[PDB]
Structures are given as structure tokens and as C-alpha cells.
């Protein structure tokens, strides 16, 4: 998910998306550990999604001040 | 590079000097290109690898980009390339005919 | 770190000289005396030189 859609989302939606993305990342890591993950690029994709979500959240809580 | 994937070029230096072919890959960081039918190498392929069958495989090796020259679309002569700006877009121009390469 | 509270008078360095002009380092110390004066409107015992005390220019209280 890109920064444009992230900015479309609302703050509560940003937090929920961060939670679900972190849960997905955890599941991906566990599959990788157990040897059940072939599509390894998903880990990096989700990591960058989380980074973008947090970036937009920080932008909002900065511009509020 | 002034030569681009898919371009039709003439080899102006090398064993294949005088041959014409299509550019099927470019290596910007090495200033090299791969041209169909140009610079064929015979590599020893082990059948024991992931490919069962083995032997001597013939394939094009990359050539230095300054050894190929674009062909003028009108005259079909090798030509250098300039650039024009048409409605704010860069256009490759053959310096011999003035046409647009692509 | 000893000097006159009033003027900053402090020790200096120089030479002791023999009759044959041999030289060794020595100090000239100030003639400091521990006196009670008014510091910031309150009594306080500080180091003051005899010369800074001379002619009653410092009030001892």
C-alpha cells in the first residue's frame, strides 16, 4: 500500500492497518522459520508498508502540533 | 546510452564488423549491449547441472556499445544521434536524415 | 589557587641568582593575610594582600 492510500486512510484506520500488517509479518516470519514460505518478497513488502503507515502517522501528529 | 533495447544497429568494429542486428539486452553499468547473431561464444555447459542435457552452447556475448551504430531509418546508413525537444519530450534524431529513430 | 580577593595579587616566577649567576626557579608570593571583610554584604574570611589592606581601603568587619 502506497503513501497516497495511506493518507486517504484515517488515523484509527492507520493504527488498525499497522496492527494487521505486523500480524501478517509475524506469520510470514513463522512460515519462513518452519520452511513453508516460498514467496519471500512478501516480508519486505509488508515491512515497507508498515514503515509507510508509521511515516504518515508521524506526519499527521507533527502537523497537528 | 544512445543505443536502446530493441534498436536495429550495425556493428562498426569487431569480428562482426558490417553485420546488422537487433539489440536484445543492454548493460548500462558496463556500457555493453547484446546484438542478435553478433559475437557468438561457445560455452561449455555441464549436463550435470540443473539442465540435464549438456555440451557446447552458442550464445551472443555482450559487445561494447561504442562498436555499434544506429541505422538511419531513411538511408539505412549508420548514423550518430542527436536530440530534439518536441512539446517538451526528447526525441532521438538521426544526424544524417534528421528523422526520428523512435 | 591562592590570590588576593580584592586585587587578584598572586605569586609570580623568576630566578634565584648566585654570585656566579647560576639560576634556579623560585616564586615571589604575595603578602596575603586572612581577614574578615564584607563580601556581598555579609562577613567572610578571605585572603587579602597587605597592600590592598593599606590605607584602610578595605573595610574589615
Amino acid at each position: 500500500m502506497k503513501a497516497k492510500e495511506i493518507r486517504d486512510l484515517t488515523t484509527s484506520e492507520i493504527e488498525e492497518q499497522i496492527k494487521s500488517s505486523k500480524e501478517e509479518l509475524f506469520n510470514l516470519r513463522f512460515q519462513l522459520a518452519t520452511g513453508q514460505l516460498e514467496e519471500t518478497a512478501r516480508i519486505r513488502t509488508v515491512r515497507k508498508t508498515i514503515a509507510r503507515l508509521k511515516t504518515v502517522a508521524r506526519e499527521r501528529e507533527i502537523e497537528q502540533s | 546510452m544512445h543505443i536502446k533495447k530493441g534498436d536495429n544497429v550495425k556493428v562498426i568494429a569487431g569480428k562482426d564488423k558490417g553485420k546488422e542486428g537487433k539489440v536484445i539486452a543492454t548493460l548500462p553499468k558496463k556500457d555493453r549491449v547484446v546484438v542478435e547473431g553478433v559475437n557468438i561464444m561457445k560455452k561449455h555447459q555441464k549436463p550435470t547441472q540443473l539442465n540435464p542435457e549438456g555440451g557446447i552452447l552458442e550464445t551472443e556475448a555482450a559487445i561494447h556499445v561504442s562498436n555499434v551504430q544506429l541505422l538511419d531509418p531513411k538511408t539505412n546508413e549508420p548514423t550518430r544521434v542527436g536530440y530534439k525537444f518536441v512539446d517538451g519530450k526528447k526525441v532521438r534524431i538521426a544526424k544524417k536524415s534528421g528523422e526520428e529513430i523512435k | 589557587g591562592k590570590q588576593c580577593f580584592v586585587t587578584g595579587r598572586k605569586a609570580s616566577t623568576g630566578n634565584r641568582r648566585s654570585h656566579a649567576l647560576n639560576s634556579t626557579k623560585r616564586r615571589w608570593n604575595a603578602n596575603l593575610q586572612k581577614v574578615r571583610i564584607l563580601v556581598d554584604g555579609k562577613p567572610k574570611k578571605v585572603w587579602v594582600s597587605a597592600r590592598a589592606l593599606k590605607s584602610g581601603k578595605v573595610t574589615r568587619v
Partner: protein, 89 residues
């Protein structure tokens, strides 16, 4: 933070014997304590934890070519379940 507390499961012969004993082995963040590990496992897998043992493993010297180095130090927790089960696969 539970998903940060737990890093990955450990799959070895000793760890498989433990799993037969209802003990699940994880690599965990090197800074967390036994209680945090217990709470993270209970939150993520919805189980009841009987106990947690924990241990540290030093960085291990490792060589590749002419370059000498070390593996990351590890913190390994062994969680004995009271109720429920964990399916790693």
C-alpha cells in the same frame, strides 16, 4: 509488542522431543524477560502457559573465507503449555 517478543520457532531434534512433551521453543528478543515471553505466547496463540524456561547463547565464532566473525547472540525460551496446543505448520 508480542510479535516483537517472539522472533521465530526453533526446529531441532531436541526441540521436537520437547514438543512431544508439550514444550515449544522460540528464539526471543534478547532484552525480554520470562514473564514477557509467557504473556506474548498466551496473547498470540490463545493458550495457557504452565511455565517458561529461558537461556542465553553467546555469539559463536564463524568463518567464511578469510573473514572472521560471529553469529548473533541468542535468547531461547522453552514454554511448557498448561492448556491447548500450538501448530507451527
Amino acid at each position: 509488542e508480542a510479535r516483537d517478543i517472539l522472533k521465530r520457532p526453533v526446529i531441532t531434534e531436541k526441540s521436537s522431543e520437547a514438543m512431544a512433551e508439550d514444550k515449544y521453543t522460540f528464539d526471543v528478543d534478547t532484552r525480554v524477560n520470562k514473564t514477557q515471553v509467557k504473556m506474548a505466547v498466551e496473547e498470540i496463540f490463545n493458550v495457557k502457559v504452565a511455565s517458561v524456561n529461558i537461556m542465553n547463547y553467546k555469539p559463536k565464532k564463524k568463518r567464511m573465507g578469510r573473514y572472521q566473525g560471529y553469529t548473533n547472540k541468542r535468547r531461547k525460551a522453552i514454554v511448557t503449555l498448561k492448556e491447548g496446543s500450538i501448530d507451527l505448520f
